[PDB]
Amino acid sequence: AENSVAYSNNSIAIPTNFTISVTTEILPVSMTKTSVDCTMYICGDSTECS
């Protein structure tokens, strides 16, 4: 939205009230810990391949 603040060199705007607002922030902290096995992945249960 457009807005032009009523700026002038002898005028001020002062709040007379207030709102106690609550914001929400969401941050990842960790991921899934994974582990791998070559003897089962690349050459699954086959001693000739390994």
Partner: protein, 50 residues
């Protein structure tokens, strides 16, 4: 670790694997045997030219 002194901690050494014991083979019911008693057990053997 390729070292003789192991510092206190927990270390990944090997990969435990349960190994198979039997080799199961499963195939459907043996039916529709090929006809050979009609050619092996028969007194009406055809002629050599016929």
């Amino acid at each position: 670790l390729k070292s003789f002194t192991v510092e206190k901690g927990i270390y990944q050494t090997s990969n435990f694997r349960v190994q198979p014991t039997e080799s199961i083979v499963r195939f459907p019911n043996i039916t529709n045997l090929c006809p050979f008693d009609e050619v092996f057990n028969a007194t009406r053997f055809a002629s050599v030219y016929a």
